[PDB]
Design an enzyme around this catalytic site. Structure first.
Site, short mmCIF file in Angstrom:
data_model
loop_
_atom_site.label_atom_id
_atom_site.label_comp_id
_atom_site.label_asym_id
_atom_site.label_seq_id
_atom_site.Cartn_x
_atom_site.Cartn_y
_atom_site.Cartn_z
N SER A 1 61.19 86.71 123.52
CA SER A 1 61.71 86.86 122.17
C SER A 1 62.88 85.91 121.98
CB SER A 1 62.09 88.31 121.87
OG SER A 1 63.26 88.65 122.56
N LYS B 1 59.79 82.02 132.03
CA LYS B 1 60.20 82.59 133.31
C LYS B 1 59.05 82.60 134.31
CE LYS B 1 64.09 85.20 131.40
NZ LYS B 1 64.36 86.13 130.27
N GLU C 1 69.30 79.67 130.09
CA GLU C 1 69.56 80.85 129.28
C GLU C 1 71.04 80.92 128.90
OE1 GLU C 1 65.63 82.60 129.65
OE2 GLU C 1 67.33 82.71 128.27
N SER D 1 63.04 90.67 132.57
CA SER D 1 63.45 89.57 131.69
C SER D 1 64.95 89.27 131.80
CB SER D 1 63.01 89.80 130.24
OG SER D 1 62.83 88.54 129.60
N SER E 1 61.24 83.60 126.82
CA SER E 1 61.19 84.07 128.20
C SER E 1 59.82 83.97 128.84
CB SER E 1 61.72 85.51 128.33
OG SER E 1 63.11 85.57 128.05
O1 LIG Z 1 68.12 85.77 125.42
C1 LIG Z 1 67.76 86.27 124.36
N1 LIG Z 1 67.06 87.41 124.33
C2 LIG Z 1 66.64 88.07 125.55
C3 LIG Z 1 65.15 87.84 125.88
C4 LIG Z 1 64.61 89.10 126.58
C5 LIG Z 1 63.18 89.34 126.26
N2 LIG Z 1 62.64 89.72 125.08
N3 LIG Z 1 61.25 89.83 125.26
N4 LIG Z 1 60.98 89.53 126.49
N5 LIG Z 1 62.17 89.22 127.14
C6 LIG Z 1 65.55 90.14 126.11
C7 LIG Z 1 65.42 91.52 126.21
C8 LIG Z 1 66.46 92.30 125.71
C9 LIG Z 1 67.60 91.73 125.13
C10 LIG Z 1 67.76 90.34 125.02
C11 LIG Z 1 66.73 89.55 125.51
C12 LIG Z 1 68.15 85.57 123.09
C13 LIG Z 1 67.50 85.81 121.88
C14 LIG Z 1 67.90 85.13 120.74
C15 LIG Z 1 68.91 84.18 120.80
C16 LIG Z 1 69.55 83.93 122.01
F1 LIG Z 1 70.55 83.02 122.09
C17 LIG Z 1 69.16 84.62 123.15
#
Ligand SMILES: O=C(N[C@@H]1C[C@H](c2nnn[nH]2)c2ccccc21)c1cccc(F)c1
EC number: 3.5.2.6
Length: 263
Positions: A212, A48, A141, A105, A45
């Site tokens: 993440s 972004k 995403e 995010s 992210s």
């Molecule tokens: O989109 C994902 N995580 C987001 C990224 C986002 C965040 N994490 N840190 N900064 N932004 C966030 C926050 C809370 C919950 C989910 C997420 C993801 C991760 C692994 C595999 C996948 F297919 C997608």
């Protein structure tokens, strides 16, 4: 040559189980500290920032662009969309989508920014237009967070991202009002207190964007206004060998602390 700060970062990395990438630009003198600065890391992210900045650039020739409504449909929701899900069957403006992407995010909001730019390649095209030859966005995403070791998709290097973040927030890649808007958004991030910020003296002002992904990928990119010093730009990227590895924001804090003690 290997500096004292680089040796401390290597010791942190060795005890972390993963691979750490760091780039600092100290705008007091334009000097740089790099650790794996030219290796590629999945951005997750942190990308972004580039998407929001690209929309800000478009808004320089379209005064009303940030107020333009964008339809949010039930099919637009993905895996993490705390802001966009409140507006399903309604609309959000591009300003609202930018703020949600950066400060919360929100992944649906990111996908709307990408679509406004014509797809992932439109974000990459903006990066090239501001002098970043390294950044690449290939997917939307949530799949841009797969973070597979060795996969070039959706990656950059710490050196490239630090230079770009400097140009966007402190330089002239954006117009003055757009640069100020980007800085305001970053300073209002809700997700960053455990990452770079946790390694810096508490009096310093920070704007940042976290990321993440799979492989325990844990990232943060920040502009920092230290007490009594010209601003710093700091990128900390971290990724691990196993797909299901846990997040390690403490490693990013430790890297920032080493950087801060080395000034
Ligand atoms: O989109 C994902 N995580 C987001 C990224 C986002 C965040 N994490 N840190 N900064 N932004 C966030 C926050 C809370 C919950 C989910 C997420 C993801 C991760 C692994 C595999 C996948 F297919 C997608």
């Amino acid at each position: 040559q290997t500096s004292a700060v680089q040796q401390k970062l290597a010791a942190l990395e060795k005890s972390s189980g993963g691979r750490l990438g760091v780039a600092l630009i100290d705008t007091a003198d334009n000097t740089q500290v790099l650790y794996r600065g030219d290796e590629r890391f999945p951005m997750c992210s942190t990308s972004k920032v580039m998407a929001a900045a690209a929309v800000l650039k478009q808004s320089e020739t379209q005064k009303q662009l940030l107020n333009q409504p964008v339809e949010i449909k039930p099919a637009d929701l993905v895996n993490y969309n705390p802001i966009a899900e409140k507006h399903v069957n309604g609309t959000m403006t591009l300003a609202e989508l930018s703020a949600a992407a950066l400060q919360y995010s929100d992944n649906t909001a990111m996908n709307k920014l990408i679509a406004q730019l014509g797809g992932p390649g439109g974000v990459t095209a903006f990066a090239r237009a501001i002098g970043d030859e390294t950044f690449r966005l290939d997917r939307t995403e949530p799949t841009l967070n797969t973070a597979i070791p060795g996969d070039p998709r959706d990656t950059t290097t710490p050196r490239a991202m630090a230079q770009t973040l400097r140009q966007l927030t402190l330089g002239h890649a954006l117009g003055e009002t757009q640069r100020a808007q980007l800085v305001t958004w970053l300073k209002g991030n809700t997700t960053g207190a455990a990452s770079i910020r946790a390694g810096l003296p508490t009096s310093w002002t920070v704007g940042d964007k976290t990321g993440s992904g799979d492989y325990g990928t844990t990232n943060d990119i920040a502009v920092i206004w230290p007490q009594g010093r010209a601003p710093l730009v700091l990128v900390t990227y971290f990724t691990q060998p196993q797909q299901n590895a846990e997040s390690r924001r403490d490693v990013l804090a430790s890297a920032a602390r080493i950087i801060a003690e080395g000034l």
